[PDB]
């Protein structure tokens, strides 16, 4: 059995740069829509007996990227491919991953069950947004972190970075701040709200580094960076795994106060930089190629957990 | 249990119409959409231990749609509804039915499988493209037609109905015209092309009724009535359960030649017929709302198939 | 893992040929009934690790042999077979594939769900009876065409094919007699009853071909038969994949009017052949044979839809 | 809901029974063969939330009997039937419940698997063959005892029932006579065979009775009686719960020595007792009519293990 | 259906008081053990057609209660009981929710697992470790708060809780903490380590008030009790759904500074509190209760989110 | 794929046998308890693309290794192992098989479900109680017999086996005594109780040997052993291939008359033998050995049945 490349439409650069790093060509597959915005997948090549990898990730229109992962790994599934592995760098409703006291679907587990149903066989994803999402399957699930990139950059970008402070911005992103602290030796501060908030850690002269899983409005990143601002820092940065940028994200982005806004290449952000100067992107293609090859000869993948490829 | 009836966003006259039909207030549901495009769903009011049915038409922007429905239906389901139900009036991807020598999904095996995995107990659908779809599911499947509604919007409103002519457009509408013939007592002709095609059966002097399940680029329709008029015949009738009109078929069908063009409304119409005046709507809400009200009560659904309500 | 070829009982001929076309012996199983007419199967050899291929057809005792098939498959998947195949030439039940307001089984679905939890992992099939039984399993199903092999026999029998005429018995034959014709490059005639059938196309002095998937009692190509000979036609042929040839068949054939019945060797033909000296056979096993190697090699065998090996 | 019986083709005169038992007249269905040996099934009559029972016994022409009974399930259930029962009253393949040192099927979960995947929800039968084929199904299973009844036959029929033996045919039915035995405070013999076989258990001038599951070509009994009569006992019964009666059976019990071959009607008989005229039957529709109407009502159905109704 | 309450091993005073609220007494069950360790669980009375609650708490000896809650499930379930509710109120494993960079297995996924296959319909239980347990299953689940009854005993007991602080031990009991100060309309403070730990919020002369979801060896609610010594508060609360209270717990809390360590009795501390006299418990058996109740009678159970019954 | 051995803590001394006659070491893995008595399992090594095999007997505290089992089954199969073999040699809740007239549980067939949830693809075990419970499984079962190496135990160690007897002690354990017999070609008594018990079988001046398949208290062969030496037996032995000895087990061996009770070693015995010095011990670690080198390179298994490696 052979790799086997597919892109979806959500994130073709991620996908060639992937293909690239594996040394192959993208999978021949025609993914359109019919006039009546129906999603209309053709496999160009026989896939019978391969590896199929299928690119794409929850991003853009996300229902129509989804349907199309679907109906791919479908197609792939029923052609005879020996397994077929979806690789979803932002996994779709993975905020919706719990009730709270509201008669509110699991919109996560409902798409992982239709992933399951479509017939994946495994799922490679990048920081999910529950570590118990990984639960939600019944196959296994490799959940790669952007956190040895994240510490590259920190360290190519930042010549203060000794002296530095790793930051949260809610309560919830502790853990990643925590790692991330730990592989510097640095001081971790902690921001939460209270329309106000409290931050804890010394800051003042100091850089701090927001750290955080997503940014989707922008609104918690832009009141962590408010408050650090209070508090006398001198600059401040922001740093994402996923770059969703949905509505006001940009016009609130260039009204704050960053120095940078750091996100990995999850998500296409080439419109999104086209529109905020202060947008840097972090290439991660190395790590879900890594990934891919290694899931592919058999290899440890939770080496990439601690090491940049 | 009581019945529950949820709308969704496609059709939202529909489903008041249908319940109005069964004396109930729409349940309390609030569908939108977040920043990113992600669905967000919340039922409002208890449905535990109920008889829910949730109304959405595989139309508009289809996957959407279909993903709404899914997770109204996986909402319901994990808030302890005692039986939920799918009214699809048009079934999503249904024409995705077979391979057919291609490497292409079945898609609305797909379809079937996430509605099977969301929760859904039991289908009420009307014309599906092809029967075999009922086979596609393992849970019970109603597939309503609208046949007694077209019956009787054909003798109210062509004058000439005994001396007509029922016509399908292509060689897998044979059933339904011919149903349609033997109860209205007529001659029935049938099309085929071969550019060219040929028409069977007398019409010249007598109106043509083109009958066929969907409309969706209107190109089949159009070469039939195209070929009607080259036979003589004196007026053309088009008359259909599916009106998605996509594409080119608002200008196709101003273009024809038809004297009218009936669907259902089974897809909302409003904005087609703002744009066509040839269009008219045949309601079928009637045939729903009886289908839903007699699987509740356990009275016979196939009752229907030959009597209007 | 290795090729293992098992046969059932209904049609041991097909089975040797596979075998001697793929440098075989028939693996060894005995296959018999205890008295009480329960199914006997022991797999005489280990099949552990193997590649298993059962051939079986849905032909003559239909319920026994397919009972032998599910008991063959889940003998061979709990004796840890590596993968196992069910190939079903001729798929039984294949025409209860829909309800059509009828309170019936969808009994090919049935078929597809207890081949499914017998432990088939795969389906060679031979001109499925509908497309859409492909849907029916979740497992991947190759539905070979007798097209090839039907074209050879057309042009190495028919003299005069290059002016004949490809005519369907009824409307939903259409699509294989289009096909067959524009690889022929010929006209295409039409026939459906409207007791009296309309025959569209000319053929007056011209041979008349009838392409159909089946013929079960033979009512439907006799009729066929009986119109184009009165349209003048100078001799008919009728060609078949599968001859059940049941009940009355045997007769009509005889007193009917055909120049040739061909059938291809999905169902064992040697006892009809004894009473009707008009059936012809044209041997499939090749196209069997080649299926079953390009999907134990990782082959392409969507290419064998096109060629004959 | 309300109870509705159908019968299958195998047994009518005890579906007809225990329809009389219940108060009920039995279901409307066709169930036919088609010319190809295909098994045609119609529900006549709307089964939409009732509570359906189809009796059908695992006797006769077996595959063709499960084969009605699957497809009569599947029909009542995408039917939309509250709750589907198959009363089985002699299981099919029950006696391929292990594969012991044999690449065997174990054909009796093969069958369990496909009752349970074309709907069954529950199971009713009568004696199984081993208790463990409870284990096959995720469903209930109601196995119901013949001993009841039998006790019965033995007081109104042995006058010499309180001196008698209560004889196993082999090893495997130690359990069941010793039940019977106990219920009547009689000795228990035991016989085992080494061609030669042992009985253990004074039986001179004592009747015996020898007690087992089934007889399905009468040599377990044949051989039991030929030891009984060595050992000096007066006359000699066997009892027996399922009469299947198969190949040699009836010429075997004609030259035997039994005074009398008691069985229940789980099949068939009149055509056996035709041509035996030492085949008594004992009825047990009671049985399964009790057991009916005391799932349907709730009530409970361990009671019948101790009480004739 | 009536309801049948069922107590297992773990906590037979739990069981013994929800059913006196619901006006009941226990179902007739036995629960032991072989001498081989095996559990041995004997239904007692029928429960066919009725609504099963069966009563475990994942506390004591976690794998033998574990194992007897499944096979009560699976007993329950193959007698044709109704519906089966597993009611949990502490979940087992439930801390083993995610992988987190380790070749971990998430136990509490495989717990829901075996519960779905041994049969259960529904949970109910209280104060999940994680809400994303919820997407673990696929039946409904219902996740309790010990909240009002935790306010209600802060009212009744504190009389300085209108100007007292509500702190959390951890990063991740941000959320419980921050609705139980809305609730009160109070200061909430919050605890992180960085062997050292920070403390936000002004806490001196002001009670503070540690709130966290379960407390297993104290060593998290120990440091925090320290912190908020350093920090100069007057007393120390600490108040926990969950009181397992394993290994050195006792003596820690002995030797701790708290005012009071206060549980709820979703596990039995009859025996802790022998040994420490600063553990008080508060009843929860009445939300228990009313959920049963609720769920049976069809009622909204998301009432109880925000009223004490 | 290469063979992973991983042992769990109830036999770690057949483990490392099987993992020496491999040429293998035993995996890396961690098995513990947390405070809570919860199972803590850590695989050290990865399993990616790994044949793994896990060792765990049903014994010791039965329900904490069988969670240990699990919980490790599912950490290999979502670490994504391409295959996980449980090698159970004592099948825990294999005596639950059957209800028989009981509300009671069949617990065996919860195992099984519980060990296809997890994940496992394959069982190995060694004579089960019921041959029946392979049918408990969808997946394939191998279950080995100690025959072989039992055989060699009598030749090797009781000199006038030729001479010797071969008694069940009970009905049920007919079919091994019959078969040990057999391939000795020796005569084979019986015994089965009426509190008095017979034996059928001349046995004066004869050695005696039951042979069964567990002694779980004892009370089965101590009654078996009375008996023979009322009948005048010279000397008894006992044979048994699961050596539970719980309760009273070791008293009554002590205070019983056996030769010897010879056990295999599928459950850790040096404790037993501690005090009581009439248990040996049979060394079958070879047979397990040889069949998981057979099952992964694909060789036949069954070949073990007859011969020892
Ligand atoms: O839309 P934005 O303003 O950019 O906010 C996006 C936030 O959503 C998620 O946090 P969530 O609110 O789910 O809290 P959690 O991380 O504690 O679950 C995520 O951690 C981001 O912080
Ligand atoms: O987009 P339009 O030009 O309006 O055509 C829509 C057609 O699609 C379907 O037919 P299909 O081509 O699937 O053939 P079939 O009905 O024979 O399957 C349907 O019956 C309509 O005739
Ligand atoms: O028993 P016979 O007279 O030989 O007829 C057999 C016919 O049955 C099938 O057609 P069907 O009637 O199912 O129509 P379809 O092909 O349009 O589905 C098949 O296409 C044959 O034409
Ligand atoms: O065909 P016949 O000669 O009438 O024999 C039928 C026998 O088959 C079954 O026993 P089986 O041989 O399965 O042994 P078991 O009951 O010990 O499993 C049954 O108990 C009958 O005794
Ligand atoms: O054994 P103890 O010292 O009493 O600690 C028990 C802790 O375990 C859980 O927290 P966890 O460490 O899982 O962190 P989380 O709540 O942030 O997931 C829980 O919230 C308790 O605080
Ligand atoms: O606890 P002990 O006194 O050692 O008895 C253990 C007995 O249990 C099993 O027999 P069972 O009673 O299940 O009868 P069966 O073998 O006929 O099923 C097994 O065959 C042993 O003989
Ligand atoms: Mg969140
Ligand atoms: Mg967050
Ligand atoms: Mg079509
Ligand atoms: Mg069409
Ligand atoms: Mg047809
Ligand atoms: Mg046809
Ligand atoms: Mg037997
Ligand atoms: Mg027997
Ligand atoms: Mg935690
Ligand atoms: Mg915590
Ligand atoms: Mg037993
Ligand atoms: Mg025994």
Same mark, same amino acid.
């Given at each position: 059995?052979?790799?086997?490349?597919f892109?979806?439409?959500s994130?073709?650069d991620?996908? @060639?740069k992937?293909?690239?790093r594996?040394?192959?060509?993208?999978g021949?597959?025609? #993914?359109?829509?019919?006039?009546?915005?129906? %999603?209309?997948?053709?496999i160009?090549?026989?896939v019978?007996?391969?590896?199929? +990898?299928?690119?794409?990730?929850?991003?853009?229109?996300?229902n129509d990227?989804?349907?199309?992962?679907?109906?791919?790994?479908?197609?792939?599934?029923?052609?005879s491919?020996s397994?077929? %592995?979806?690789?979803?760098? !932002?996994?779709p409703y993975a905020?919706?991953?719990?009730? &709270?006291?509201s008669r $509110?679907?699991?919109?996560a587990?409902?798409?992982?069950?239709?992933?399951?149903?479509?017939?994946?066989?495994?799922?490679?994803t990048?920081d999910?947004?529950?570590? @118990?999402? @990984?639960?939600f399957?019944?196959?296994?699930?490799?959940?790669? +972190?952007?956190?040895?990139?994240?510490?590259?950059?920190i360290?190519?970008?930042?010549?203060?970075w000794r002296?530095c402070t790793?930051?949260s911005?809610?309560?919830?992103?502790?853990?990643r701040?925590?790692?991330?602290?730990?592989?510097?030796?640095?001081?971790?501060?902690?921001?939460?709200?209270?329309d106000?908030?409290?931050?804890?850690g010394?800051?003042?002269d100091?850089?701090?580094i927001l750290?955080?899983?997503m940014?989707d #409005? !922008?609104?918690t990143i832009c009141?962590?960076? &408010?408050?650090?601002?209070? $508090?006398?820092? %001198?600059?401040? +940065?922001?740093?994402?795994?996923?770059?969703?940028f949905?509505?006001?994200?940009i016009?609130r982005?260039?009204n704050?106060?960053?120095e940078?806004?750091?996100? #990995?290449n999850?998500?296409? @952000?080439?419109?999104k930089?086209?529109? !905020?100067?202060?947008i840097?992107?972090?290439?991660?293609?190395?790590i879900? $190629?890594?990934?891919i090859?290694?899931?592919?000869?058999?290899?440890?993948?939770?080496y990439?957990?601690?090491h940049?490829?």
């Open positions: 059995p052979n790799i086997k490349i892109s979806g439409s994130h073709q991620l996908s @060639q992937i293909a690239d594996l040394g192959l060509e993208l021949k597959v025609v #993914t359109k829509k019919f006039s009546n915005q129906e %999603t209309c997948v053709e160009g090549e026989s019978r007996g391969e590896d199929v +990898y299928i690119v794409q990730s929850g991003c853009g229109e996300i990227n989804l349907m199309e992962l679907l109906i791919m790994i479908n197609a792939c599934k029923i052609a491919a397994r077929v %592995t979806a690789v979803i760098p !932002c996994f905020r919706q991953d719990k009730k &709270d006291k $509110a679907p699991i919109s587990k409902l798409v992982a069950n239709m992933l399951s149903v479509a017939g994946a066989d495994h799922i490679i990048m999910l947004h529950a570590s @118990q999402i @990984q639960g399957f019944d196959i296994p699930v490799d959940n790669l +972190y952007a956190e040895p990139a994240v510490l590259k950059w360290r190519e970008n930042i010549s203060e002296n790793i930051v911005p809610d309560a919830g992103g502790a853990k701040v925590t790692s991330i602290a730990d592989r510097l030796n640095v001081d971790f501060a902690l921001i939460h709200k209270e106000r908030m409290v931050l804890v010394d800051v003042k100091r850089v701090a750290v955080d899983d940014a #409005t !922008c609104g009141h962590a960076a &408010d408050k650090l601002l209070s $508090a006398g820092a %001198t600059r401040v +940065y922001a740093i994402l795994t996923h770059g969703i949905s509505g006001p994200a016009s982005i260039n704050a106060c960053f940078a806004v750091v996100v #990995t999850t998500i296409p @952000q080439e419109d930089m086209k529109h !905020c100067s202060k840097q992107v972090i290439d991660i293609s190395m879900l $190629a890594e990934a090859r290694r899931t592919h000869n058999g290899e440890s993948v939770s990439l957990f601690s940049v490829p």
